[model samples]
Target chain A: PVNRPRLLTVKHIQDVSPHLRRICLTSPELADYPGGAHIKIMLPQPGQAHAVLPPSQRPIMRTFTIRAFRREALELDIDFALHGPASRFANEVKPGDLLAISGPGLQPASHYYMVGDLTALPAISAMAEVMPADARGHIALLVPYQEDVQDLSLPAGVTLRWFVGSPEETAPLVEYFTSLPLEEQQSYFWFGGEEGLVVPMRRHVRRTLEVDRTRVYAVPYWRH
Target chain B: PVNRPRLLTVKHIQDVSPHLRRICLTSPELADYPFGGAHIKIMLPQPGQAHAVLPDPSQRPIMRTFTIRAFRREALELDIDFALHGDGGPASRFANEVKPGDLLAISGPGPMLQPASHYYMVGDLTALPAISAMAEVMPADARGHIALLVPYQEDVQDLSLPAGVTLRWFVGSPEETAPLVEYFTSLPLEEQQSYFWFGGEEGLVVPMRRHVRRTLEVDRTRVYAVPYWRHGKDEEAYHHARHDVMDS
Candidate 1:
């Protein structure tokens, strides 16, 4: 079901890493927003004040994952990837600036193997934080710079591997994943990155490695 | 995700109630089959055919839907409880004559409703299996009530359900479903997030849906009133009755 957008005020903003910034928005109705759910941030179309709610006429919008939600303060923290229109909006907005937003929608896992590029950092971070403290998994994060490997509150049993390079340089990471030992019990794979990188990696994992289609969720976060 | 149809061999069959027969089928492929789902469509073989065969996409096989009464992944066995009303339909005939070694094709263990904190479920004999299946999978902390209408007192079988769910069985013929309707109307329903599932004869189900929608004022989306079968009608008419309720 589609939900009408809610207008929120930018309360705080801070740099989380070299390439990512956290923008905290405040709205009384956001107190019940579920953690880890993705919300669409409405981007203004030249002369609109709070981008058009109900969005019937269609307006520019960008999707971002919720990094944290503080119910008591009615604050929602969303991490912005500093490379596109969403990044520009986040970087330019000042305190008390109103922005329209909708959704906090969820879109699930098992012996877990996850791979994500810079665009998916927020989602992978949220996922890692919510996982049980004792859960075991292998996670690979490819970033543009070494400073992007900021601290993440992942489970203690998780092995966090970081690769610093362009989208093309992430091929070795996929090759490394394909060579990992497959367990007898069901194992899951989550990959989100550039369209060029994620598509081939998804095909190799599902078809060549013979992994069940149900166990994989490889989505293209951008068309780069 | 889609699951392929699996061929299952009947291992055992027993009469659970006066109007209900429980059939147990086993297959190695069922070892990892997801169990908590609604129903499975059984593809019946042609009259003289030894085993069930998948028909061409254009030419569909005679299929019947039955709830997965129980599934034992470890044992690679599953139970499907069938209503034996002597309907003279292909499904009823198959259930009555099915024996060990007989093979049937099945697809889906489709989506099932997981009840909220409070719940209400009502169904006739044909829907008993699904109602029971829902009760079995319900969260241990969840509480609910079930109103089941059966043809005879003897047709009420013991159902494996959560302790919080209370079962009230109404004994009456399909021609007279007033007792079932009255039972539901008398309940003290409060305004809360609750789930309601009802299925039975078209005549009875339509009125029950109106009661839930107009009287109880429950959200139409939260209430599921499906007509599982039609009285004094063939499959063609039954389909129309079901579609009419669903489309609305």
Candidate 2:
């Protein structure tokens, strides 16, 4: 018998950008952590904090999929695309910080697929790395920051491609995916990041490309 | 600025049957929650342990819309019927213990309109309350419920409905969620003009749409399938996982 790992604590925090941080966590609980799926990370703020939490502390519970995971070290990585100073506490995350992350929940995805943009970079990278090396599928990501793009690794068959963008053009990642070719094979399209982008992108694939809806799951992680 | 009061909390859990509990949540964080729309409520899990920070010792992170399920309070009162479970976790356990004073965190009740009173409502027994609410708001002679249910093999109970509204129930297996396509076809929808509304199972919606399109030829705008809870997926996970279907 094995014990399922809950998130232990925020072990390392590195600011990779003005609005993004790479938070490393240690969790004996996530020994069975499913990659590409997310955990609800709840952060606490001092009294009078601005972010919202219901019937409790004013903390923000944002969703982030695993960027990478290691079973031996019992560690996991999540890339947090921070908002500006408005989300003050979330922007100031540090090591030894206790963040409330509930469940390594599972969502449906393909053995072979393509994900795009900063919104999906975490999902594609995690899924490719989590599966066995001789795995199937290709991952395509279009992100704004060059430094964050350099940190991800996807499997060989999983073609990981990045579409570069500027800070202001960040909102167009959703449009970027809507215009791509829908490969004929049975593939999954799992995406996140810019929240409003998912609806149009998911619609284009199903309507214009004539793809089946159940076979595609486009999730927008955040909405500005 | 005034702090927005939390309207949706764990307190709305109401027991409708042995296997199902009704969780009533006030939609929006303030007064005057609009009518005839859907919103998101992020349910939380209450932890009694010393390790994890319990947002509410009595709530779990499970968010789903209650439709307007008939609201009386100034704010929108959403009646969320929690399908009971064999395994006791946050959602099931919270449903079991929820009382009047408990509070839960709720997000938005985004505005959406079905465009017409003409509607074809479908769901498992758990969705009866929402269906009933929608039917009640509708012109008595115009709305109906097309339920795909699985009653006991011999002992089946009757549902409450008005005589003017049509009522039909199909027998699916006793499983929590299963594809109800065959029974859906036998629904006699061949002559009706209305929007199709199915409230559970993400995969099942695709087929329901096909049935409406190929078999009945109902315009896509007149049909809508909302998988309130996926068979094996939790409420929160379903939020991020979009269905494999075309958007309206």
Candidate 3:
């Protein structure tokens, strides 16, 4: 029920970095759009110029995190990683370009051990922007380009860390998690990115840390 | 269809651990039973047929699927490892009470794992036999990851695999497939030939199958995922649904 499809037009586009683009979509439909989880955006069918409603043929679609949605501006911002379909769309997308999206999925997160690559920054940042003032945890983002490490506002207790180089260098995050005194009571985790980082981290969380399932929110925004 | 139904006898049984039973079924019927693939159908006993005598060719007997763990061509032997998941289904019940002399008809060696330069294999206890069998035979130069979820830590075994393969043991009941999806999403895949193999209960298989084919957009030929069994449902209830999930 949360995924009632809505049609929104591109309102603005800004290149956040060499690898990241922030594209904002706006529609009166967002007067009170549900605000959680990632979104599934339907791409126009091959040979088609516009994205039709889902009822037609099932067109190509991909999931992305809702970077930030501002109600006053009637805007829903999505960060596009510059590769793959969504990124290609953002590269040439202009104001008034049409985009269709559906829901807010996943059961939904809580000391947030937020982790991801540039692709997941939108959702992670969306969470960080609103985490309760007292929330405490760590953020480890694997951004291959050092410039991809943009600024973010965080709670006083939260630490921002970056792994700049090949995303495969996840050992630092592993050591960070293993070294922490993460009590089952308070520390929560969030994970995203390509499968490379997500695979081992889940292996660690489920196998080593024995973290309770309810305390973590992990997503694989894309796969190899 | 390569392997057809043949009445086979339980030649010997060995409890590998507290949670698994390594059962070797044998018969002259297997003399030329082209050995390949991991799947097989075992006809289950009804009211009082200890040997589970075939009713009539027309009377569809209760059947469950299992993986062939090992085969000894010299002895005409086929071994299957049964994961004693606490489900009190017919197969579990039959496995618990089955002995060396018990009989069950068998068929199949379905959907063989495709040879791929890179392999990603994951399965629960139900699939360890297939995974182990496949792993044992991977090309000496093959590479990739293999993750297994066993109910008990003791269920872990020294699986033989290629030197380049990373073996990870996950200890937990697969009450959630999120971990499976997450693990799948973790792989750093290349455009090179890949084999994404999976076998598990319905809940995990459904999501992984969809994620692999739909979300990951893997070529169907490169992906082989099956719901070995369903939770809270017997093979009878799973009979039609399995076909639906398999083909659709």
Candidate 4:
């Protein structure tokens, strides 16, 4: 059956922290959505748009995965992980704005192996809500702030590892991921936040650990 | 310590074929560059215009990765594959009104991946040059085509298929994420497969694998899917979906 898509308008923005804000959008758009499906909240235009600074430049399009949505309720909550270059967009966002919301499409049903830095927190909470109640996995989250580690929602069986970064030094990302122990036979690796992190993480999984390449999914979203 | 970037302008537009174009850009900036590295290009705002559409909406910057600077000796030869989506953006417009001497900026190059031999290619015509480069550079004639399922407005240009394997364009509607089964179904079951490579939307690639899993499941080892573009999305969003959210 085709999913009934909607354009969820922003109703309110709640501050989870000084940096992070939970932007809630509600409209007739999100009415009958299932549990696992997601919505693509277009940060800019969903597709291509003309360049403003350089008149003769190709347009940029950014996409963020939806955190949660209530079908009968007609509202969707998108958790924006505020940090780095994305800070401007998140910090500037306000209420009553129109966000082109699409999909309540089929959600992923798999044993998820998720890991990331501060940028991946929203997606982590997102995946946690969808996995089978009995299913379990491990998540490694790295951040510098103690506030970032305070309270998080996840599956009961999933083990959480919060790697606190020293305020004075920068540690190699691979140092954290390389030490983790693999659990289940069927697992999918979902990674994001920083760039350059994937090359090592992916190499370790494939060349070192010898996991099935198809099953080993890794993506570091930033350019670093 | 720093890479020198070029400020070249768009010169001429050559619609080599209905689906492809060879945009000849000349930059006084690139007039003195070596052949080893690469060159990325972009344009500046007009007197009236202010901002450009960022490659990723989240980044607030307008950046697009065109072709790899193939042969940049005398005049830089930048080959770009156009989907002809009926738009007037930089890439498309660059292919349209680019005169014999228009100006464009040619920026510094990025890191390059070491070349590989036992070839596995996956992409639309836009990625054909790199695929062809593999065949041209490699000694043994090793190649197999998993053509994307798309209709042609005109017949495709005849790129000499390396003698050994197979070549066929799997045709589907301009708006289909399915129907890639035809290409996989037609593959010969005899040959052993090695490296797996792909480029296109996340939506289409998801369904395209059903046949591969059922038939060519054993050889699906070094599989890589580069979602060059999605059905109703651009490169930036495509990259995020593939790289960020873990969705099968």
Candidate 5:
């Protein structure tokens, strides 16, 4: 009945892009994992053959966004950024390997103001695929390289932009979010990424703009 | 051993608001204590006692953790903003009738993670001092949102934040988690990595600690959601439970 750590089995794998790998995981435990936003997966510590759950006081763990979740099929899709220890595990682990995951992640909105960097792709992409046909919003992504950009299938009313900048460069995202104009106060703001971008933009949406707390999604994917 | 308690004398008192009072304490021991915002424990005066009584082995000690508003190390003076809850708890009476020369034993003066980035700060009036102090010292380039919830709009203090940071005040009761629930729930716990800070009643702190841990899970290093005090119960009654909440 609780959102305890669920054990999932690897189903398949796909190299989504040069910097991302989509690993398909399935588990009877995921029958009701809910639509994904963010989750913590226990990763294997040194000298361990497989990642375990209920890890020690200092458990080694990694957080990832759910790219997709096939509820009826008892399957979940999470993409690894291919840049951390978890990515190394993604490359070495086989389909039959087991992983443990836990939950806490939310819903969508109208006039979406989605922003983030490379780390925001999985979440941004997930929401993009699920936006109501009539949903309208603007998504601005700041990436370290142009190749990291994806041609997402956005709704007719949705507008998406990818700005190329180094990880240290967060000004473009801030300027883009600050200059945006909202209508009727029905806007939902989603800000994610490195601290620099998320911190400043949160002020614009949650402070200067006075957006309803329920309508804004501000999260930092990394300190960098 | 150095975290030992230091007994000091109340140097001054001022009613900052109808429901809040500022009590100034002075001690030569504080000359060694740095001037920065952190936490400290105030030993309350026992019945009929004019000063803080030492801990008794037979009973739960009455001590509360308060935020350091201002500590002029040069003058060996410290300021604590005490929230008046209608003579609600032991400390309330002390803060209400506190006068210059009243002696109180104190400990702590303990912490800040200063990183130049977006910050999301939420707390009650109990957090006014710490948050206000931190805001003043935050990097000029720092940007983020500060949501402060107090029972009265009049209790809100003027906080000096960076030009990039924005601060908002919300009025609500401590027993009701309306302020925290509204602000945190509005946003989904994203998988992003960012620093978070908090201080308020335990009713609010427990749920928040759990939400960040069991729900919107993030790294432990970027967290500090402390329960400055609890509702209904006194510090001694909720002491262990407070630690459990922090562990979560």
Candidate 6:
């Protein structure tokens, strides 16, 4: 994997929702940036100097989902979790504060059965945005607060469902999944959440459902 | 994958060790057989059945997997080793009664082990065939270790293992193979990308998988730990064994 860390200056910040904040950045390197995918954000410490291209010193790395990107304008938008150091930085970032980022993230499947908590909202959203208009299947996004739910411009055949509760109360997601009709057509399963939840869901999809290994992508976006 | 049953005729049988029996089979189908490190599912006939019959795919026969001990292209021959538990299981019974002229049926030459930088193959007597084949076929320059847990020191057979592969024999009960774990822990593991292949009883393989994958931090894809059999389980449900390993 190539690790070309490019410095990006924060151009705009917006609280897309109560629990989700969008941080827009710009850099000349963003001209060909493969955005709308998962990317690593190299977080700076309180007194560390700006990150060098190929740094002699290592920095803390946090992963986030890119919300949007405009190649002509050399702009990128990332949705950072509002509960961590990234959030603190997002809130305090001035118009010209520079941060380092790198990625060429995952491709979207034609059909999906996606389920995630607030931590995976950005990724789920980005996938829904890029998915073809004829793409099909279900999506479930669980958030702590009801206000965190946002309307998505997903395919007409794709249904978006929302669940509201603490991360620990993820039983409803699995229950819903269990009740879904097992379609004979090829479709992919994408799941992300706390480790406690993702692991079991992965087992269910891969083992119980007998889905082929390539069709399922269940990972713990965050650990509880 | 087409699941056609291939008919094989027994050509020879030998008691290679005190606890293991080797059976050499030949079939014209072997002409196209892709020989790699993989296991074949032998469909054993009933007690008095004259010859093996192809069972329905839905109603599978009493199938047991055995590694191809050797495959000779010129003779269209393949060798399989069966670990004699002496408990009169279907496979054990078949191995004991099978003669030179007997006909048998089998399916599948399942996926072979992919290449890796360094290898760590560990198993018990039942898995000896697989581990042995893997060690023998590995590139001469490839480096790794092979640990086989057998019932006795005398049960170890001379296998065509590579010089770079260190073969260790662990004698006695399944859990008595602690020396294998000790040796692995002491190795300079952080330096090389390694593949771990472990197959044995469920009780032993379950914990060994956790140790390698979770404790040792080996990538799940790089580790293949299979439960060849359970300690006291008699019924060999093929799908159960497959699901158990896949879930791990």
Best by TM-score: 1
Residue-wise C-alpha lDDT for candidate 3, range B11-118, written one tens digit per residue: 888988778898889998787675423677888766555445553554566678888887765467888888986668768876798799877788756535556788
Please write out the lDDT profile of model 4 over residues A1-224, one tens digit for every residue. 12433445678898775445788889763544432233444344234331222232423335565666544456677766676323555677778765554453212223566667665666767666434443466777667676777466654666777776642222544676677676435666766666655556677677666555446556675565
**Can you write out model 3's per-residue Cα lDDT over A7-36, one digit (the tens) per residue?**
899988998788888888999888757523
DockQ for each candidate?
Answer: 0.02, 0.01, 0.01, 0.01, 0.01, 0.01
TM-score, each model? 0.52, 0.42, 0.49, 0.42, 0.49, 0.49
Off by over 4 Å in 5: A1-224, B1-3, B48-50, B53-61, B187-193, B210-217
**TM-score: model 6 vs. ground truth:** 0.49
Between candidates 1 and 2, the one scoring higher on DockQ is 1
Write candidate 1's Cα lDDT for B89-123 as tens digits.
87888788889987878886654563367778788
Q: Is the docking of candidate 4 incorrect, acceptable, medium or high quality?
A: incorrect
Please provide, for model 6 over A1-224, each residue's C-alpha lDDT reduced to its tens digit, 9 standing for 90 to 100. Answer: 23367789999888889878888899888764531456788876657776544544666777877777666578888886666667777777778898899764422245678888878888877666445445678888778888888877766778888888888888787788767865534777888866756787787776666666556778798887
What digit string (tens of lDDT, one per residue) describes model 6 on residues B1-248?
23467889999989989788889899888775653447778887665555566855544466777777777654677888888777678888878887997777888666345466687777888888777666544544567777777888879887655456777787877657677667655665432467887787665566667776555676677778788877656655545765756684
B1-248: candidate 4 lDDT, tens digit per residue: 12454545555566656766666555545544433113254543333444332223343334555545254433344433445555344555555655666554444554221223344445565455444433333322455554644457463555444444355565455465345544455655432535555555455555544444565653434455455555666554556676652234
After best superposition, candidate 2 residue B177: deviation in angstroms? 7.9
Better of 1 and 5 by DockQ: 1
Docking class of 3: incorrect
Docking class for model 6 is: incorrect
